[PDB]
Amino acid sequence: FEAQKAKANKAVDERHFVYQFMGECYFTNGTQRIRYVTRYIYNREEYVRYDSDVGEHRAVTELGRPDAEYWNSQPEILERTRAELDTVCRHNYEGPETHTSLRRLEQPNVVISLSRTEALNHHNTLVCSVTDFYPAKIKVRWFRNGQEETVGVSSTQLIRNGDWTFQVLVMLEMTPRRGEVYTCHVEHPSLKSPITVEWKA
Amino acid sequence: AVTQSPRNKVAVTGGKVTLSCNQTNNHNNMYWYRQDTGHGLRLIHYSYGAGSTEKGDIPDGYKASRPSQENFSLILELATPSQTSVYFCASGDFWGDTLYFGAGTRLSVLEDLKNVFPPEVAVFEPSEAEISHTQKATLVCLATGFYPDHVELSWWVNGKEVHSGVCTDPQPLKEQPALNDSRYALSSRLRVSATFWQNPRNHFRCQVQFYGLSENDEWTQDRAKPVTQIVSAEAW
């Protein structure tokens, strides 16, 4: 599935300098709604921009007044850019994405571990390790003795690993009594039935 | 604008040719196309700017170089016969949606060199059979023997070249079609009023610019070196 790209327009006419240009495609409710914006940045400062909702290039700063005017004057350029809403955004979504990103699913690897040695009747800490999963949206809960609990529980927010796999950790503040068995429960679209890990105290 | 040097040149197989191109208009992209028959125009190498060079559809056998912004040149190391054809350089802006070509370049890569022959021009005077039957005199020129077909026929009347009332053959004539290769022949006309031709003062001439060899070219044969020169013939 050949993917398409946005085309930067030509600018009109020891210290470091950084330039950056990007084509941002915003898909609200799948392809149903699409907002397209291109940003031209020179030293962390956005100076010109094309907002799908404005229909043309606009100067965000005075440093971008030249470029904006010239690109809007030349019909060829303006239409080229404008059309990218379909030729790039819609095309990639309905094509490469739908058959690659939008349809990739990775199942988590849950495992329960306890901080300090099992000290019966002595407060300790239990942690649920949900790792390696995609997409993002996921839920986690702690099952003590058949009863879910919220108090004394905390989970680090989504930890993006960078390799298209996410991660999250949930700590349980309890006390390992005798007999009772703890179990972590997590809901993730990468699976039909909530995966549940158990730990006999 | 854009200009190519050399416009035309001959070279021996295994040689080493260097086609140069220099455009005025500040264009970022530059291209090197090769024209042939049954393939039209084909891209060999292009460049997004100085220091840049990209492979086209037929890069094999060629190298490209974008030293300056206004200069892009195609390089052929171990030249071969298969690389004989016309080369068109082009300059244009980003994304190549607007490109301007140059005059062109005729390249001849021979298996050796023992084939180059200058043109044998000769002006043929009109017949009174026509000068009276139609009141229109027609002088016919003929350039024969040349090889390769790098020629340019021009009519110089009284010293001044004229295009008014002229007709030159589209493509040369292969004197020996059967043969894998042979000299070529070109014919051109020039039709002037009867009352005009009939005047010993009116000087007529037929020039044939031929492009062959030059200094750096070993001639291991016998006849004079078939170098670049202008053959011709007059009439009154």
Place this chain on the structure above:
Amino acid sequence: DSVTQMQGQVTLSENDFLFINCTYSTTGYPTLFWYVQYSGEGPQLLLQVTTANNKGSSRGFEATYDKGTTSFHLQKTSVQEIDSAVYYCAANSGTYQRFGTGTKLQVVPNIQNPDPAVYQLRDSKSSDKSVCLFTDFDSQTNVSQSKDSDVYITDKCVLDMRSMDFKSNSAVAWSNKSDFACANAFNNSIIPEDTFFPS
């Protein structure tokens, strides 16, 4: 991304309807072009169309970017003799333009009054070496080559006396073969049976 000009070579009478066919095939959203290359010079731009489904036109020509047919045929209504050249179709949905094979257009002038004749010419060099000039024939006759081999015949040629307003075809023929009369120069050539053979 690839172009396809099915038109090998096209030839038609002056003031006729020109229609050169071109069909592309890409994976993107290519811009389509037409380039005209006049004998002797390099190709130049005639017309182009970036946006799909709509036509571009220049100096009497016009072509439409038909996506349903993935075509970009070239049209001309009153093709002048000046429009005789090689026409190139090209498309670019990436960084560089690809071209089609090419189509040669030969627009023959309109002969108001035929006058088939076959004269002879003696050079200023010698005199024994001559040349037969088959000229003035109407624009519709076909000048064949030499079915033999020792004889040489050039294709049609349109002469034009500007400051006189007069266009007339031609076609030179010769042979190093000693015995060669102007009555055999175009034997297998279907030429006007009303040709003037002086002598």
Place this chain on the structure above:
Amino acid sequence: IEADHVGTYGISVYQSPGDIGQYTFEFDGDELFYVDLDKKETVWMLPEFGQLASFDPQGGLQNIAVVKHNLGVLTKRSNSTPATNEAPQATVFPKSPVLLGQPNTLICFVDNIFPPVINITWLRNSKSVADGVYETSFFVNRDYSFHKLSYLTFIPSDDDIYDCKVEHWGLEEPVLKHWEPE
């Protein structure tokens, strides 16, 4: 700025001096692929992803070219206004829960990077380690700065201590985020 998904189909970055460029594609925040400006070839993060879709490198090459141009233009339009450096902040963690012996991967997440030029090397007991290191591209940040990730493959053992050594111009001296299996 709200939406269900956001694809950045075309991210071109160009720096001067140094003549440094980068071209990538991003979706939901992860890197789809990047064009190797030297090898002139596309490189997908998920090799499998490269099996399903495709992208012509030249698309990135032409852009970088345009970006380089405009950089020269804008540098003048603002009479050589230089870029103010930043102090990058690192963070280290394991890809999965650590279990002594069981091979894992150490991740160093460096953020607030600007300009996009940094050195990120790993240290094993204060010793420079090479093999087993994979670095990502520069990801884009809303404030137009950048962020990068580096990965190291190791064998969990209390017998060793690690630290991510970050070297950047915005830092008075190299910094290192220490991390141990303790």
